[PDB]
């Protein structure tokens, strides 16, 4: 399995130290193997980080904060600007590494790095706008103001699916806001974590700044638990399951810390009878099949109107038959493999429980005979009452259910514990005003004639209910990475009444 | 113990139903006695709310939300405007009831109701500004927007010290934001809870609105626990101890709900050698003695500079000797009684543990022989290392400690788990920039030449660390009472690439 | 005439001093007669202000500013709160005076005073929100901030149509922003000017504030020219014709002053074939007939679709036949008289020039034989090419032109020099996105399925092109009444390189 | 002269077409000579633009707007991102060209281009933030919103001193805001105008966009007058004298257009007795001598405290004696030549009128015998009453006047017609609160312990009084380049009362 030469340009070797602390690479933890989901073959080896490595790096990361906080915000924005340009120079290579290690199709991965690049460009302008307020006081010779200050150290625990995009949105904002970043990437994604850190480390070194500003570790739940329990980390940004999310939240809340939660999503698309069937079918395909259904924003529930029901799914199966399943690096591939053999096993056992709950498999449902973790994109006719519908299967399974009124459609959409993304395909404005109103969708993302997956830097990305409540990317999200202080200065010689 | 006639104008009788649900007064719970802290005599009786009453009122409160959410925000602001005017008509009476039942001196109480009145006036203007955003999209024929919507039902659990001000700041914002309010007042403050509810109920009835919009209950931890566990309440605003705060937070976080925490404060005043000693002494007195030290913002720690140390405290004791201790309703009273006989017992046992930890009582420390819960205002010379300093005694005890450098002063101020309010008395601007900077105070409120207690409607009131993180009154605090939705409307016929 | 008595309740007599200069009433100018447009009979007499009176009042108004600017903004907001309550106590009487003196129907006038009261409620909250900004500096130990400060004296020149609403929007903002107000009301509306000033003067006196904070004068263009040329007045808010607007602007621009312009509006309503004809007809009637077409937002142009053309206007004439023309104080009156006999003469000569340009009068066009200034509501079939269309006639004349496509409709709407208000009546979502887009309406107010006249205090009211550019009421309009200063404080010992 | 070659690297030749109209280079106007102020020798020739060229380019620029306004704002921001990178590649060369053609020292010019590059980095983030608002309506089933739209074509008339920085601030904002830019550079700076346009044209061509988006012309007042009178240009951004500013304003106001005015500045530095004399002397030198006093922010007035008066100016003359006067391209040069021989003649005749008004020349005042336009840096002891003080001389002349109290100092600072920048050198916190307060400086820029010239892209740069009122760079300046529309959509079936 060569190259090799491709990994060397990303700064990777056969065996790699998986701990970036304190400006240098180390690792006294176990030696893990990085596998490609396309053939289940070794890309390289990673010497994981131990708690010993974590503590050594954490002592320096905390110490580096003093220096970093003192740097003016526009000057911090200039470091982030150079991070974006560093990523631009390796865009093509990082995209390939994301596809090779994670399993997502080449366009996605280039686009993932492109999302981080677009975020750096925004963070430069944002550095000039981390504004405070001068509030009028009700007392004479009193200056009242709202003051923002860095938190210190921001902990970032990321998932396998966006092995650098989640860090990108968090680190760009955290760094620009004067915070140091302690990153713990996915255990199955160590090479992307190293290559991403080497780009950041490059910029920090080029500007004579301590490498401890961007500390990173490769490992399992051990280092993750250490971050959640660390009193030196005021903010922990978690990205993963609702199961692990609550666990992290509980530990962080106990120590009076704050945490940004970006949890599981059971996203639904509602198709009204008056919808653009061509637009709706195309949208449903790319929302459900995209990243082999391993996206937080992946459409898992299809709420179909009775009038269009049959005609919609027969022309959806017709499109599902045309999905090219292959190597994510090969041109024309639409669906790649599932990240691990474990997820392939989970998908197959899920199909069995779906059948148990009365689910009728319209298309797919079977595994594909290959060296990699390949499965068929599945469409399931099921009742909304079935427990598997309220679950969250991280594979290409789409549950389709019939509805009569818009009131019953919203009832189904809001019934699930998760509240990340939702969509309606309709032409009538009365429905659009209902959908976006108080009695509409209870999600963080509410879309009209656009799928659940289409999300950009401009607006604050995040979910409600079981998806946490945390917000990323644009808007006023920066305020989560800083501390608000209400200040009042008395500059008058006037003494209080005796 | 008459009048009586004063209570009748506030709508109170000898025995009162303590449950306002569903637009009517009830109560199937136990009969509690409301005592005056000045003589420990019965004012009136309150028939508490049971879980049965809570459930009946909660079913209607949840149902009323549909109607309330549909009312335009400026029209909701008009209801709040009339609430302020209703309070203005009973300002004099409510102030007396706050003094009589809670124990705070007449000026405070009138001022407390005045704070609610000023909040209504702000909430009217705010109703016209619950603005969303139209974000530029990166895709042609796409409308991107940030949409705000009511949460539904806001739960408000209040403490004894501000028996209506805490509700006032919460309810004004919650109601204007389209939410219904379920209030559970202090168990020792039921009469203020009833009288406050009768004013709100008056306005709601006058406008043909369901009374269930403002549901209120009198009771113990039972009704409070019910609110924290209620899945129908997306936001729980808690005001009380850090002990109970964490308990409420834990229960609310488990059910994927949000909670606004306004917890305990161990507030400190730092006096620099170059300070206006006249201003600093006056400020320290009113910050420490005010409301018999039963304020969340009460100065409990005095961090004194060695150069001014002796000269400051001898002239502080000289002022402490001049504190008039009497009936809070009597003119000229500066210090009233502690809210309950239990708090008087806690104060006295605290003095004993303070002596154990090497605390040298400079002034007071003893109880006053009276029918009411009167104690002497205390000044204690103590080392910052003592455990009682990190505690929170809800009485008039001031711990004084010597410092040499501004660096050791900030070290002491930030050492405590609580982070609500802090102050510095200085004339040099280099210290002011350090104090308000990243290496300064870690509190939510950071004041210069003004005590820890002086807080107005204009700025977002709240604390950091063990004080939670929740914000009240002005600024962008309204966003906590609503849900953010990132919306994208595709209005173009353009189909995604095949 | 008697009543009389009703005038005494508003603080008016048979002969009134028309100059509120230096906290007291005076007037060395000519004696003018206030006439009722319903019968052309004398209500009372007003002793106008001379330039001598103006100068004496202007010296004190400028001097009072020192005191007023020193008052904290929330405390200034409390004065404007009290002004609203003072107006509430005389709501019924002011509405009657406005109707009697100006000629507008009783609902309007009562509604107009209510518009001012609503602005007072918003201004209280706004006083707490005149915020500055703390911008991050790119240099270490540098504090960068945006600072707002009062301008000093705000000059308000008002028109006859809104003899107190225009002042209300301006004065509420100006006063809260720390500015003194010098008011010059319309020469045909002095009694409203006096009665409005007496309410303000009442509040200012009750709070021991100099009356010079609110200076007001009754007179012609003489006092208006004096304001425009006065170097002591940094901001002149003008409300009137485009002819006088440019004159005021040119005198103010010459002396490096700023002016708020709220000029003429030749507002159009576009009716699409798919519109709710019942809604559109009702809307067109009240937009065109309302205030006898003497509103700045009055619909003067009806852009009708060919498919609905005939059917729309025959059912519009059917409705125009039902318009009750009578005493504005009499119940059921829909159309009252024109403000002066001069405006009645202008309307009649206009009808003649309309006939000259090929205008075919569908309904009305004639004067009504009575003692008052009554005219018939007119509908005119005309080509958009006609010059009279591009002009502004301040009477009930509606021009109606046929169109085929949306491009043609927008072409007509944008063709006029004025750009105040515009409306479309359609059900199509595409038309709305085009109408609100870059290629849509070029007006300050762009409405969908609502007439040109419906405007509230929540959003910034103002017009583009020949309507000036000035904004009133809500949003960020306050910034016009203050001066922005970009401040940078260097608090570091660092010296520049030698 | 040769180099030559260096010019070819910037896209310049011996003779250059000076009209970038309709995506290609032309010019039917006269042939002008570009001279170097260091020796008065020809760099190259420029074939100016005629009115014929202007009209041809203006027809296409107006036509290109349709395409440009349709491009999404984040996508427009990407073009401005690329413009910054294009400038980065030629940073070294442009700085040299600016120095060679304008006469400013090499650090400035390299610094000036860097100011543009910095603005490009901010404009990318700003493209994602040109937000509208969703205002709560007071009527049910009504959507109220604030909508921003491009103006169309922005006219930019620039001065000689910042031959590309002024365009940079304007064009970055204008382009991101969806407007086309028509640029008219200073007649004495055509080569900088061409080289700057070639960089923009490069990016526009690389992205298959019409070159007409960025139209530029070389010429005198002829093309400038054409822009001011052009009805196709809604916004004219003028940068020059107060004399030409008023002329442009009056022509633009007449046609109901808007204009951004960045006029003359007679900036003052106030030195208090308690100031850091080392900091104040260094600051005064670089503020007054910088760019040979040919900056809009150049310190022209020194307001000195009587206690420090003599000691300050003797140590200022001592520093003025050390000013290196030479070739701006030569290392170590602190003062270069004046832009033209005409400005050298104006400086010398000014010295004569200064002597007439009782001005006593402390240092300099004489011309330097060389081929270039070199003059001595001048210090003048003068009374504030002298008329020359209130004027603006565009050379290195510093007027110095004695003061006793802060009232007297502010009186002098505010006495001049111009209100751009102002500074105080003090250590007292009281003076700073007075200086930044309502009774302080009446300028747009108010600095403490930092000179009048130090201005960055974070805050809105602009002046008050005779400096216009227009704002550039950061803050909410973008709103000037777009049109605000207050929109209300009625989506309810409710009909108005018959
Ligand atoms: N803005 C603020 O931060 C703020 C304001 C006022 C008071 N306080 C804090 O209040 C404390 C003193 O007030 P207190 O003695 O009334 O507080 P407390 O914590 O004992 O109880 C306050 C309220 O919570 C209820 N409650 C108690 N335990 C509960 C539980 N487990 N679940 C649900 N409800 C429960 C009580 O019935 C009461 O209504 C101080 O620590 C003070 O700092 C804070």
UniProtKB/TrEMBL annotation, chains A, B, C, D:
Q: Where is the Aldehyde dehydrogenase domain?
A: 30-484
The chemistry this enzyme catalyses reads: an aldehyde + NAD(+) + H2O = a carboxylate + NADH + 2 H(+)
In this chain, NAD(+) is annotated as bound at 158, 160, 184, 225, 241, 264, 392
Documented EC number(s):
1.2.1.3
Task: Extract the coiled-coil ranges from the record.
Answer: none
Instruction: List the catalytic residues.
Output: 262
Extract the InterPro entries matched here. Answer: Ald_DH/histidinol_DH, Ald_DH_C, Ald_DH_CS_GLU, Ald_DH_N, Aldehyde_DH_dom, ALDH7A1-like
Listed A to Z, the keywords are:
NAD, Nucleotide-binding, Oxidoreductase
In alphabetical order, the GO MF annotations are: aldehyde dehydrogenase (NAD+) activity; nucleotide binding
Assembly notes: Homotetramer.
Q: Which family does it belong to?
A: Belongs to the aldehyde dehydrogenase family.
Please give the name of this protein.
aldehyde dehydrogenase (NAD(+))
Give me the gene this protein comes from.
Answer: LOC100282748
């Amino acid at each position: 399995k060569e190259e090799h030469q491709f990994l060397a340009e990303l700064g990777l070797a056969q065996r790699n130290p998986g701990a970036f602390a304190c400006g240098a690479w180390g690792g006294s933890g176990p030696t893990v193997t990085s596998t490609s989901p396309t053939n289940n073959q070794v890309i390289a080896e990673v010497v994981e980080a131990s708690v010993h490595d974590y503590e050594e790096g954490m002592r320096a990361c905390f110490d580096a904060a003093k220096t970093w906080m003192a740097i003016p915000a526009p000057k911090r924005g200039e470091i982030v600007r150079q991070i974006g340009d560093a990523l631009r120079a390796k865009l093509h290579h990082l995209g390939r590494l994301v596809s090779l290690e994670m399993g997502k199709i080449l366009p996605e991965g280039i686009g993932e790095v492109q999302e981080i690049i677009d975020m750096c460009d925004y963070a430069v302008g944002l550095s000039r706008q981390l504004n405070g307020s001068i509030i009028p006081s009700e007392r004479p010779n009193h200056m009242m103001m709202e003051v923002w200050n860095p938190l210190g150290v921001v902990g970032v625990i990321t998932a396998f699916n966006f092995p650098c995009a989640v860090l990108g949105w968090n680190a760009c904002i955290a760094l620009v806001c004067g915070n140091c970043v302690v990153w713990k990437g996915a255990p199955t994604t160590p090479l992307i974590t190293i290559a991403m850190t080497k780009i950041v480390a490059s910029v920090l070194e080029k500007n004579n700044l301590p490498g401890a500003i961007f500390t990173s570790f490769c490992g399992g739940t051990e280092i993750g638990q250490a971050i959640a329990l660390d009193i030196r980390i005021p903010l922990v940004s978690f990205t993963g399951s609702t199961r692990a999310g609550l666990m992290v939240q509980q530990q962080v809340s106990a120590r009076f810390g704050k945490c940004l939660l970006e949890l599981s999503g059971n996203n639904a698309i509602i198709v009204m009878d008056d919808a653009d069937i061509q637009l709706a079918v195309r949208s449903v395909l790319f929302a459900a099949v995209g990243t082999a259904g391993q996206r937080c924003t992946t459409c898992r529930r299809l709420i179909l109107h009775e009038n269009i029901y049959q005609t919609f799914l027969d022309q959806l199966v017709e499109v599902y038959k045309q999905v090219r399943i292959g190597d994510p690096l090969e041109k024309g591939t639409l669906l790649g493999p599932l990240h691990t053999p474990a997820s392939k096993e989970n998908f197959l056992k899920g199909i069995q429980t779906i059948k148990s709950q009365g689910g009728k498999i319209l298309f797919g449902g079977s595994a594909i005979e290959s060296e990699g973790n390949f499965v068929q994109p599945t469409i399931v006719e099921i009742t909304p009452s079935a427990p598997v519908v309220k679950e969250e299967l991280f594979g290409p399974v789409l549950y389709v259910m019939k509805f009569q009124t818009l009131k019953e459609a919203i009832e189904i959409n809001n019934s699930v514990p998760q509240g990340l993304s939702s969509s309606i395909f309709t032409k009538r404005p009365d429905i659009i005003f209902k959908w976006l109103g108080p009695h509409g969708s209870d999600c963080g993302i509410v879309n009209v004639n656009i799928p659940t997956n289409g999300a950009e830097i401009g607006g604050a990305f995040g979910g409600e209910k079981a998806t946490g409540g945390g917000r990323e990317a644009g808007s006023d999200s920066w305020k989560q990475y800083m501390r608000r202080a209400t200040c009042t200065i008395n500059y008058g010689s006037e003494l209080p009444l005796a």
